[PDB]
Every structure is written in structure tokens, then in C-alpha cells.
């Protein structure tokens, strides 16, 4: 049934208020409905459950605006993205998961299937619409842009040699849209 | 001192890089390095307080020459040449896996994360930012551009696609990273 909803909802609230440290099947099984091998059938791991619950928890906050101006909408989405990544547990949640995935193939697969593939598709989609209105050159690969935008933020988060601030986010978009050469 | 002592440090670092790149990080041990180099563990422990620091320092010096920045006066050509050597190292060498797994472990090991920056990433960044600032000083990059941001939009973009492979890391990807940035992605 759609009972998968109540679970995701519970997991989402937990993740956004305290991270994954105490995210257990037992606890989730109570706060919501029933475990009964269910959670295990739907979600084979703690990471799977975390990823699924996380995706749906930030889905709306991270949705792309479409007011006709790619610059403004990209800035808007990236700023909502950086707020989630730097002001809520979202950043710590994803970096830990990304970290663990480097030596756990199933978790890596789950990360892409329950979170990253969809996020990238959502970004590429908004980018394609701009590319249609001729706001982005016809020969530009939108998937590359995703890595040069959100990817860049992920990078500073994973390897914090430099801070993720609004100036950073704004330069990301401006450098790309206007180019860095004279 | 810093001569016969630095020579010794270099030999050890060379041994570390050789072992690390052929056998992987799990195989790297102080006992193994000491045996292979002929230098006592006592000395090793003094220079590298941990296995993490040992691996990172050896790794940085093993790829240094290969990842050095050409400085021919053509930022586009030099950037493409460096990103391609970088891509080769990260995808066609054990180096890619070695580094990504250290980045992964660093996510839950504060000390390793600190060593990763001090012995590898901070210096890689400075090397890249330096090449970029040079291009800016020569006028090939707008003077109001923050080169540190560019670092994340080039190498950072590669690391990202490498850490989470939803898309492939090939030459087309590499070339697009540079053209998008240098030429911009908006018409005209």
C-alpha cells in the first residue's frame, strides 16, 4: 500500500532533527506503524531507508523554480540547496553516506537509485528548458553543468579547504553563465 | 639538518608511493616501508604520525610530476592538458580508487580529514589557484574572477562525478568542463 508514506514521513522528521546516528529499524517501527519484516523488504539497509526518507524530506524545498529566467531560478535553487546542506543535518547526512558508499557497492547503488539520479534529472530538466528558450547554448551538455554547479558545492562540503558561502554560490552561476574569459 | 635527512625522507616517500600505487592503501604499513627503505620505524613514526599521513604524503609526491601545471601562456591548452593527466590518474590508475577511498574514510575520521587537507588537497588547490591567477595576471581570465571557485568547477566537478558515478568521466566531460567555464554557456 501507500503505507510506505507514513514511514518515509517519520524518517524524514527524524533525519532533519537529529541525523542518522540513532536511525534504527526498531525505533522507526514504533514511531510509525509496524516492522514485521516489512521495513526489511522495502529497505534492505539503514542507508537505503535513510536515503529514501531523505529524498522525500527535501524534495519540495529543493524543487526548481521556473519563472522564465535561468539565472534567477538557478540562484534560487542553489541557495535553497546550500541552506539545506549547511544549515540542516542534510549535509552531514549525505557526506557520511557518500563516504561509506566508497567501500560499499550496494549502498552506492542505493544512493544513486534513491537520491542522486533523481536530483540530477531534476536539475538537468530545468536546464533543458532554459536551453530550449535559447537561454543556454544548444551544444551545451546539461549533465556537465550539474557537476559544475551542485557538484562544486558537494566538493567543498566533502573536502572543506574552502567555505560554502553565498559568494561561492553566486560565483558558481555567474562564472558559468557569463564565462570567466574577457 | 635538511640535506642527508631530506634525501632520506625522499627515498622513504618514493618507497611509499611505489607500494601504495601497486598494492593499495590497505597493504601500506610502517613495518613494510621500513623494511623496503632500510630506514627504521622510529624515524618513520617521527615524520608521519599515522598511516593516513604516510599514505597521503607518499601519494602527493607520487603524482606530483604527472599532475604539475604546464605554464605555456595558453590557459585553455594548459588546463586541458592538466585535467587530462588528472583524469588518466583518477580513472586508469589505482590512484583514483586510493584517493576516493581516503576521501570516503575522512568523512567519519576527523584526524584523517585534517591530514587529507594538510598533505594533499590544500597544496593541490594552491597549485591550481596559482596557475589560474597567473592566467588572470596575463589577462586571460577576467580580473574579478575568484580562482578558488574555478578550482571547484573543474577538479571538484571531476571528483564529484567520481565519488558518485551517475555519469561517466571521459575526455568529452573534461573538455566540456573547460569550454563551459572559459566560453560561458549563454548565447553570444
Element (H, E) at B104: helix B94-106
Smallest Cα distance from A135 to chain B, Å: 6
- CB contacts of B167 in chain A (<8 Å) are 120, 143, 147
Same domain membership, residue A86 and residue A100: yes
Same domain membership, residue B139 and residue B66: yes
Where residue A163 sits, what CATH number does that domain have? Answer: 1.10.357.10
By residue count, chain B amounts to: 188
- Gap between the Cα atoms of A148 and A134, Å rounded: 20
SS3 A44: coil
Same domain membership, residue A61 and residue A40: no
| Phi, psi of A123, deg, nearest 5 | -70, -45
Smallest Cα distance from B96 to chain A, Å: 11
The alpha-helical segments, DSSP class H, found in chain A are 4-18, 25-31, 38-42, 46-58, 70-87, 90-101, 105-111, 117-132, 142-158, 166-178
Q: Are B186 and A74 in contact (CB under 8 A)?
A: no
Where residue A39 sits, what CATH number does that domain have? Answer: 1.10.10.60
Q: Are A154 and B110 in contact (CB under 8 A)?
A: no
Same domain membership, residue B122 and residue B100: yes
- CB contacts of A111 in chain B (<8 Å) are 164
Same domain membership, residue B21 and residue B68: no
- Gap between the Cα atoms of B176 and B184, Å rounded: 11
- Gap between the Cα atoms of B27 and B51, Å rounded: 11
- CB contacts of B161 in chain A (<8 Å) are 147, 151
**Chains A & B: contacts with CB separation below 8 Å:** 161
Structural domain containing residue B134:
51-188
Same domain membership, residue B181 and residue B100: yes
- CB contacts of A143 in chain B (<8 Å) are 167
Smallest Cα distance from A168 to chain B, Å: 7
Number of structural domains in chain A: 2
CB atoms within 10 A of CB B43: 15
Same domain membership, residue B127 and residue B89: yes
Element (H, E) at B99: helix B94-106
Q: Which of B118, B142, B154, B164 to mutate to test the interface with A (most CBs of A within 10 A)?
A: B164
Matching residue, cell 568542463: B177
Q: How is A133-173 classified by DSSP, letter by letter?
A: TTSS-TT--HHHHHHHHHHHHHHHHHS-SS---HHHHHHHH
CA B140 vs CA A15, A172, B133, B154: distances in Å: 46, 19, 10, 17
Q: Are B44 and B34 in contact (CB under 8 A)?
A: yes
Same domain membership, residue B130 and residue B66: yes
| Phi, psi of A15, deg, nearest 5 | -55, -45
Query: What nine digits make up the cell of B57?
Result: 604524503
Determination technique for this entry: X-ray
Same domain membership, residue A75 and residue A30: no
Q: In chain B, which residue's Cα lies nearest the Cα of A134?
A: B187
Amino acid at each position: 500500500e501507500e503505507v510506505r508514506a507514513e514511514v518515509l514521513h517519520a524518517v524524514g522528521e527524524l533525519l532533519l532533527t537529529e541525523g542518522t546516528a540513532q536511525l534504527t529499524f526498531e525505533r522507526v517501527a514504533r514511531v510509525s506503524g509496524v516492522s514485521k519484516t516489512t521495513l526489511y523488504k522495502w529497505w534492505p539497509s539503514k542507508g537505503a531507508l535513510a536515503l529514501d526518507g531523505y529524498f522525500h524530506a527535501v524534495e519540495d524545498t529543493l524543487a526548481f523554480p521556473d519563472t522564465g529566467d535561468v539565472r534567477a531560478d538557478l540562484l534560487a535553487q542553489l541557495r535553497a540547496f546550500t541552506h539545506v546542506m549547511t544549515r540542516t543535518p542534510g549535509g552531514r547526512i549525505l557526506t557520511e553516506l557518500i563516504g561509506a558508499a566508497q567501500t560499499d557497492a550496494d549502498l552506492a547503488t542505493a544512493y544513486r537509485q534513491l537520491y542522486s539520479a533523481q536530483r540530477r534529472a531534476l536539475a538537468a530538466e530545468r536546464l533543458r528548458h532554459a536551453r530550449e528558450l535559447g537561454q543556454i547554448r544548444p551544444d551545451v551538455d546539461v549533465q556537465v553543468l550539474v557537476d559544475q554547479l551542485w557538484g562544486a558545492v558537494y566538493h567543498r562540503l566533502l573536502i572543506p579547504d574552502e567555505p560554502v558561502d553565498d559568494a561561492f554560490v553566486t560565483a558558481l552561476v555567474t562564472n558559468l553563465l557569463d564565462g570567466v574569459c574577457p
